[PDB]
Amino acid sequence: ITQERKNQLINEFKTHESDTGSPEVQIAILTDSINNLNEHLRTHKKDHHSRRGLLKMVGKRRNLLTYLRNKDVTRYRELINKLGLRR
RNA sequence: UCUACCCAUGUCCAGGGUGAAGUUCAGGUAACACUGAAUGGAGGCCCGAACCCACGCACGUUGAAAAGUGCGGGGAUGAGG
Ligand SMILES: [Mg+2]
Numbered sequence: 638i639t640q641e642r643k644n645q646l647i648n649e650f651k652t653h654e655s656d657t658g659s660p661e662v663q664i665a666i667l668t669d670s671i672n673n674l675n676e677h678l679r680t681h682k683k684d685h686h687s688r689r690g691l692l693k694m695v696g697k698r699r700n701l702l703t704y705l706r707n708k709d710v711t712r713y714r715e716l717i718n719k720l721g722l723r724r
Numbered sequence: 725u726c727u728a729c730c731c732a733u734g735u736c737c738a739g740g741g742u743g744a745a746g747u748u749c750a751g752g753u754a755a756c757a758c759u760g761a762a763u764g765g766a767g768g769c770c771c772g773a774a775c776c777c778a779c780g781c782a783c784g785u786u787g788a789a790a791a792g793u794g795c796g797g798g799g800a801u802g803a804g805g
């Protein structure tokens with residue numbers, strides 16, 4: 638467990654001090670879980686059930702990224718640079 | 725001392741072509757795949773002298789020669805000479 642990743646990408650674009658539901662925070666946590674799960678699948682190549690989990694996370698993260706991009710174009714660009722995404 | 729195979733140690737193979745893997749960059753996707761370009765220089769790879777071979781024909785047949793010559797021919801970085 639890491640609230641580290643919360644308090645980092647809360648404060649970058651914080652609505653509240655104890656913001657949790659910011660797209661920033663969500664996308665960041667998704668990015669952390671995605672990347673963790675990828676390295677599981679490097680080892681456990683034929684864990685297909687878990688891999689469907691990955692594809693759902695990826696789809697959530699994409700949809701939240703498309704949401705920012707349409708909402709706040711600058712705020713989107715700051716998030717993808719810090720996480721190191723492309724889209 | 726010919727020749728067959730082997731062992732040790734040397735050496736030879738003008739030139740030209742083709743463009744494997746890999747790599748890089750770009751694209752590419754959540755990751756990979758995958759795509760393009762450049763690079764790269766593989767091969768009992770290609771064309772072709774030396775060299776090695778001996779497919780066809782002619783000639784020769786008391787020969788220039790007890791196996792050759794002429795004109796073409798095959799291999800030519802290899803299980804090579
Ligand atoms: Mg050859």
Ligand SMILES: [Mg+2]
Nearest residue numbers: 771772799800
């Ligand atoms: Mg040749």
Ligand SMILES: [Mg+2]
Nearest residue numbers: 778795796797
């Ligand atoms: Mg000849």
